[PDB]
Each structure stands twice: as structure tokens, then as C-alpha cells.
Design a protein around this motif. Sequence first.
Motif, PDB file in Angstrom:
ATOM      1  N   UNK A   1       0.714  -1.214   0.110  1.00 36.98           N
ATOM      2  CA  UNK A   1       0.111  -0.008  -0.084  1.00 36.98           C
ATOM      3  C   UNK A   1       0.897   1.294  -0.105  1.00 36.98           C
ATOM      4  N   UNK A   2       0.032   2.466  -0.374  1.00 40.42           N
ATOM      5  CA  UNK A   2       1.046   3.684  -0.274  1.00 40.42           C
ATOM      6  C   UNK A   2       1.466   4.027   0.899  1.00 40.42           C
ATOM      7  N   UNK A   3       0.842   3.444   2.036  1.00 43.66           N
ATOM      8  CA  UNK A   3       0.990   3.885   3.288  1.00 43.66           C
ATOM      9  C   UNK A   3       2.059   2.773   3.963  1.00 43.66           C
ATOM     10  N   UNK A   4       2.327   1.686   3.266  1.00 43.35           N
ATOM     11  CA  UNK A   4       3.237   0.900   3.869  1.00 43.35           C
ATOM     12  C   UNK A   4       4.817   1.130   3.137  1.00 43.35           C
ATOM     13  N   UNK A   5       4.762   2.165   2.250  1.00 39.63           N
ATOM     14  CA  UNK A   5       5.960   2.455   1.870  1.00 39.63           C
ATOM     15  C   UNK A   5       6.172   3.933   2.238  1.00 39.63           C
ATOM     16  N   UNK A   6       5.168   4.768   2.992  1.00 42.96           N
ATOM     17  CA  UNK A   6       5.427   5.764   3.674  1.00 42.96           C
ATOM     18  C   UNK A   6       6.164   5.518   4.920  1.00 42.96           C
ATOM     19  N   UNK A   7       6.647   4.218   5.272  1.00 41.20           N
ATOM     20  CA  UNK A   7       7.282   3.961   6.147  1.00 41.20           C
ATOM     21  C   UNK A   7       8.765   4.790   6.009  1.00 41.20           C
ATOM     22  N   UNK A   8       9.242   4.261   4.750  1.00 47.55           N
ATOM     23  CA  UNK A   8      10.373   4.694   4.121  1.00 47.55           C
ATOM     24  C   UNK A   8      10.276   6.401   3.938  1.00 47.55           C
ATOM     25  N   UNK A   9      11.283   7.115   4.330  1.00 48.59           N
ATOM     26  CA  UNK A   9      11.034   8.793   3.793  1.00 48.59           C
ATOM     27  C   UNK A   9      11.184   9.023   2.358  1.00 48.59           C
ATOM     28  N   UNK A  10      11.195  10.173   1.909  1.00 51.76           N
ATOM     29  CA  UNK A  10      11.279  10.697   0.862  1.00 51.76           C
ATOM     30  C   UNK A  10      12.814  10.828   0.302  1.00 51.76           C
ATOM     31  N   UNK A  11      13.606  10.717   1.485  1.00 51.23           N
ATOM     32  CA  UNK A  11      14.915  10.817   0.924  1.00 51.23           C
ATOM     33  C   UNK A  11      15.690   9.636   0.785  1.00 51.23           C
TER      34      UNK A  11
ATOM     35  N   UNK B   1       8.730  21.111  -8.570  1.00 49.32           N
ATOM     36  CA  UNK B   1       7.359  20.688  -8.357  1.00 49.32           C
ATOM     37  C   UNK B   1       7.566  18.896  -8.998  1.00 49.32           C
ATOM     38  N   UNK B   2       8.045  18.913 -10.242  1.00 49.13           N
ATOM     39  CA  UNK B   2       8.082  17.616 -10.973  1.00 49.13           C
ATOM     40  C   UNK B   2       8.934  16.513  -9.915  1.00 49.13           C
ATOM     41  N   UNK B   3      10.218  16.999  -9.588  1.00 50.64           N
ATOM     42  CA  UNK B   3      10.935  16.293  -8.915  1.00 50.64           C
ATOM     43  C   UNK B   3      10.515  15.893  -7.525  1.00 50.64           C
ATOM     44  N   UNK B   4       9.534  16.681  -6.944  1.00 49.82           N
ATOM     45  CA  UNK B   4       8.836  16.782  -5.710  1.00 49.82           C
ATOM     46  C   UNK B   4       7.725  15.761  -5.660  1.00 49.82           C
ATOM     47  N   UNK B   5       7.025  15.556  -6.564  1.00 48.37           N
ATOM     48  CA  UNK B   5       5.625  14.765  -6.349  1.00 48.37           C
ATOM     49  C   UNK B   5       5.767  13.796  -7.775  1.00 48.37           C
ATOM     50  N   UNK B   6       6.032  14.014  -8.855  1.00 44.25           N
ATOM     51  CA  UNK B   6       5.773  12.908 -10.058  1.00 44.25           C
ATOM     52  C   UNK B   6       7.144  11.975  -9.887  1.00 44.25           C
ATOM     53  N   UNK B   7       8.399  12.661  -9.793  1.00 44.76           N
ATOM     54  CA  UNK B   7       9.497  12.173  -9.666  1.00 44.76           C
ATOM     55  C   UNK B   7       9.500  11.381  -8.502  1.00 44.76           C
ATOM     56  N   UNK B   8       9.005  11.642  -7.423  1.00 42.24           N
ATOM     57  CA  UNK B   8       9.151  10.994  -5.978  1.00 42.24           C
ATOM     58  C   UNK B   8       7.927   9.664  -6.223  1.00 42.24           C
ATOM     59  N   UNK B   9       6.884   9.686  -6.686  1.00 42.45           N
ATOM     60  CA  UNK B   9       6.043   8.597  -7.085  1.00 42.45           C
ATOM     61  C   UNK B   9       6.866   7.761  -7.860  1.00 42.45           C
ATOM     62  N   UNK B  10       7.418   8.096  -9.014  1.00 45.33           N
ATOM     63  CA  UNK B  10       7.843   7.125  -9.972  1.00 45.33           C
ATOM     64  C   UNK B  10       9.170   6.460  -9.231  1.00 45.33           C
ATOM     65  N   UNK B  11       9.954   7.300  -8.300  1.00 40.28           N
ATOM     66  CA  UNK B  11      10.993   6.528  -7.611  1.00 40.28           C
ATOM     67  C   UNK B  11      10.424   5.617  -6.737  1.00 40.28           C
ATOM     68  N   UNK B  12       9.413   5.585  -5.910  1.00 37.18           N
ATOM     69  CA  UNK B  12       8.691   4.791  -4.975  1.00 37.18           C
ATOM     70  C   UNK B  12       8.491   3.607  -5.813  1.00 37.18           C
ATOM     71  N   UNK B  13       7.628   3.835  -7.081  1.00 36.85           N
ATOM     72  CA  UNK B  13       7.445   2.790  -7.825  1.00 36.85           C
ATOM     73  C   UNK B  13       8.506   1.989  -8.481  1.00 36.85           C
ATOM     74  N   UNK B  14       9.400   2.468  -8.955  1.00 40.73           N
ATOM     75  CA  UNK B  14      10.418   1.713  -9.831  1.00 40.73           C
ATOM     76  C   UNK B  14      11.380   1.096  -8.687  1.00 40.73           C
ATOM     77  N   UNK B  15      11.552   1.699  -7.395  1.00 37.86           N
ATOM     78  CA  UNK B  15      12.421   1.089  -6.359  1.00 37.86           C
ATOM     79  C   UNK B  15      11.553  -0.245  -5.876  1.00 37.86           C
ATOM     80  N   UNK B  16      10.158  -0.280  -5.729  1.00 35.91           N
ATOM     81  CA  UNK B  16       9.485  -1.436  -5.362  1.00 35.91           C
ATOM     82  C   UNK B  16       9.529  -2.462  -6.231  1.00 35.91           C
ATOM     83  N   UNK B  17       9.263  -2.042  -7.607  1.00 30.58           N
ATOM     84  CA  UNK B  17       9.214  -3.347  -8.608  1.00 30.58           C
ATOM     85  C   UNK B  17      10.896  -3.969  -8.830  1.00 30.58           C
ATOM     86  N   UNK B  18      11.729  -3.019  -8.988  1.00 32.19           N
ATOM     87  CA  UNK B  18      13.090  -3.594  -9.168  1.00 32.19           C
ATOM     88  C   UNK B  18      13.571  -4.432  -7.932  1.00 32.19           C
TER      89      UNK B  18
END
Lengths: 143, 150, 144, 144
Positions: D12-22, D88-105
Motif C-alpha cells: 500500500x502507499x502507506x506501507x511505503x510511507x514508512x520509508x522517507x522521501x529521502x 514540482x516535478x521532482x517533488x511529486x511525480x519524480x518521487x512517486x516514480x522513484x517509489x514505484x521503480x524501487x518497489x518493482x526492481x
Amino acid sequence: MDIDPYKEFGATVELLSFLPSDFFPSVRDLLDTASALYREALESPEHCSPHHTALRQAILCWGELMTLATWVGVNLEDPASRDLVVSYVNTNMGLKLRQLLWFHISCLTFGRETVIEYLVSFGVWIRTPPAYRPPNAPILSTL
Amino acid sequence: MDIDPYKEFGATVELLSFLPSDFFPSVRDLLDTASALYREALESPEHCSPHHTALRQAILCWGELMTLATWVGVNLEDPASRDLVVSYVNTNMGLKLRQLLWFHISCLTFGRETVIEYLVSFGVWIRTPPAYRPPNAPILSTLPETTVVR
Amino acid sequence: MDIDPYKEFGATVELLSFLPSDFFPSVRDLLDTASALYREALESPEHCSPHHTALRQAILCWGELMTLATWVGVNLEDPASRDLVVSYVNTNMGLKLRQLLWFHISCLTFGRETVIEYLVSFGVWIRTPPAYRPPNAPILSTLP
Amino acid sequence: MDIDPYKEFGATVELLSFLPSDFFPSVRDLLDTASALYREALESPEHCSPHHTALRQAILCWGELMTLATWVGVNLEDPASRDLVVSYVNTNMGLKLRQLLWFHISCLTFGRETVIEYLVSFGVWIRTPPAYRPPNAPILSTLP
């Protein structure tokens, strides 16, 4: 599309780039050979081989190109400009068409494997420096 | 050398001599149809079929004629003469290329026997005067004429 | 990485460009179709197909794009360049999104094979002259 | 819709909020990892896995977003706010895509079970106050 007309025959445009442009015979010579050797097979109603299926289309393409160039020259005004368009068609289109005709005639006559080995050996030759390059250039033979 | 590019496939120019110029899609349309239906086989290293071989050769011929005519035009500054050469090519060589590409694509798609039957019937039709033939030509399609898929 | 979003489904961008760009339903219409037909499966904790795994990501990509475009438009001072940016996004990206949503919805609804046959048939149709083709366009239907 | 891009994969998007955005690597690093490890499967015509089906779409989303932002910055006539756009990009969309790519890889390299256990343990860690937080944080590894 990125069609290579020799890829289905085992060659490539990089392999035939070994041979220069001054190597391929004249289109008249090639068509005379084609007639003399395979007229009854090119005029035949049969898929005698892919080489025939392609040589027919090559002959027709040459016919269309010569028709267009003749019509252009005739409807043209300056003889310099006429000979100019003739030079352009000759170099570019004649070169490609006689590459194709040579490839397919030579294949039918000697062998596809033989022709590929010949291209490799001719590359060896034309790369060898002249001080160590034999004057007896490679040549396709049956005897 | 008296070569008929269809005699090898069971046809003749006299059989396609009836189909009008209005019947053949533009060369761009036919090349798109090819690129989209048989590209993986036309760019393949295999003799998938005589139709693929002839199609490759026809595409090469068209590209070459286009190079020639385009260079000629761009060197003939007069747009009148440019459009004249363009008319000539599109009328003779463009028409022959459309004819050939259509024959081969339609063969690969429907069948050689089907295409030859269609040519025979279309000849029966276009030879017949309009006052005595049905108005709606015979049709070769991959679809029911209602054109609905399920 | 030279990725085709369709070649795992048997299609290609060259095959979906074989159709006109004036053919694909609007993205609002397609998202409504999805919410109507497969909402309880897209919101599900199940794969259920590769088509759902792809359609979810397409919808989320559209959401991100819309967010960014809306934000830049809102923060942009002039009202003449918002039309330019919205036209650009619509055409370039909305076309791809329309293609993708159409492909996947139509697949789930009718069949992958039927959708590909429809693509080739409609292309040949719209490329054929009218007098020598069936008069009424092809259409996908579940109603015999 | 309320699509959660991870509950299909067990999170869930709240199980990955355990990890910070940094915590999330850069998109360059993650795409390099993908090219290194699963290029010939992302470019493949096979439904090799839902993780592949999702990684392809994520990469394409990044491509479209980058195209849009580049075009926008180009047509924009001030870096003062071009930088804010990319922020704005790197803060919202880049971050969501980082989460997604990390999770999948990660779920491809180590496993979904291991990745979820890692998320739980890292939540434990990053919640533990620093005075009682071990320095040897958890980490995903194939070797000791």
C-alpha cells in the motif's frame, strides 16, 4: 521499412560494400548473360527459385527506370542537363541495379555459398596493400 | 525479355488490365498496409514466400524511382515541369507499383485462388455495360459487408 | 530502453497508428467506460490479467500528467499559453493514452485477437476506395 | 478511481510511507539498474511478470513526463520559475516514480516477501528514537 534485399539470401549491403562500384559489369552485359542463360526460366510460369523471383523484378525495375529517364531526357531541353541526369541515374541507380543483378545471376550460376565466399575473399584482396596484393584478382569460375 | 511479374503467381497483366486506376489505394497507403501487416517478415532473413520476395523488390524499386524523380524535380526549378514529371511517374510507374503491391498484399491476405476468382469476376463486371451490370462492384474484404466484429 | 507497451500483447505502435487519430474515443469517455465495466477489478488486490496491470498504470500516468499541466496552467500568468500547453498535451500524450486505454478496454471486452483483426481490417478499410469496400465502417460489438 | 498501484502486488502507499522521501534512489540510478538487470525482459514480447508489465509503463510515464516538462521549460522564458517547475516535478511525480521503480526492481531482485519484511523492519528502525536506534540499519542483500 528497412528492407535489405540480400538478407534473405544470406548477404548484406555491408558485405557487398567490399566490392567497389567499378567492379560490377554493365547492365547490358548482365542482361545479356541473364537472357542467354535463364531466358526460358525467367519467362516461365513457375517459382523456379527466389533468385528468379527477384531477377524478374530487378529487370522490370531497370525497365521502368530507363523508361522514365528516356522520357525525361526527350522532354528535356539542354543536352548538358540531359547528360547530367544520365550521369546521376547511371551512378546511383545503375550501381544498385547491377549490384542486384550481379548478385542474383552469380548465385544462380555458381552458388550462394560460393558468391558469399567470393565477397569475403575479394574483401581480403582489396584490403591487402598493393605491394602484397596479387594481380590475379579473385574471379568466379566453374572449371 | 518478355517478363510478366504475375505469370509466376498465376495471373497476367491482361487480367489486371481491367481494374481501373480508381481501384488501387495510394502507394503510401499500400506501403503502410505492408509495414503494419508483414514488416516482421519483410525485414526477416527468410524466404517466407515469393510474395514477400516480390514485395521487398517492389518497395526497393519504388524507393529508387522516388529518389530519382525527387532529385529531378528539385533540380527542375519550374514547378510546372516538376508537376509534369510527377504526373508521369504517378500515372505509369506509380500505377504499376500500386497494381503489384495490391496483388501481393491481397494474395498474402486472402489467397491466390480467391484473388484470381475476384479478378475474373471483376472483369466480368467492368466489361459489362452499366445499364446491364449491378451498380455495386464485387468486393474483396476480411469482413462481412455489414462490417461488425464480435 | 526501447520499450513497446504493446509487443507483450501482440500489437505495435505501427499497428495502432495504422488507424487515424480521429478514431480513438476521448479519454473521458474511455475512463468512464473503465469505471463502469472494470472498476471493482482495477480497485482489486488481484492481477486478474496483464491488461489490468497495464490499465491501472495508464490511469495513474494520466493523473500525474493532468496534475502537472493543471498546476503549470494555474501558475502561468497569461491565458493564451494555457491553450497552447493543453493542445500540446492533448495531442501528443492524450493520443497515446487514448490508444492504450482503447486497446486494453477493447481487449478485455471483446478479445485480443478480435481487436487486432479489427485494427488491420479498419486500416485496410479506411485506406481502400469507397466504391470497392463495404460502405459502413467496421465496429466492435457484443450483440449477435 | 482509488487505484493503489501496490495492493495488486501486496502493499500500500502507506506501507511505503514508512520509508522517507529521502530514501529513494534517483530515477537515473534506478533506470540504470533496470537496464543492467532486466533489459532483455523489459524489451521482451512476453508477460514475464506483473512487475515487468508495471515497470514498462512506469518507464513510459517517466518518458512522457520528461518530454512534457522539457517542452514546457523550453517554451518558458525564465529559469527563475523553470527551476520551480522542475522542482514540482521532482517533488511529486519524480518521487512517486522513484517509489514505484524501487518497489518493482526490488520485488524482482529480492522478492515481494523480503521487500515487505524490509519495509516493516525499516519502519521499526526509523520509528525507534535515535538514542536507541542501531546504526546498522536494515538493507536488502543477496549476501551477508
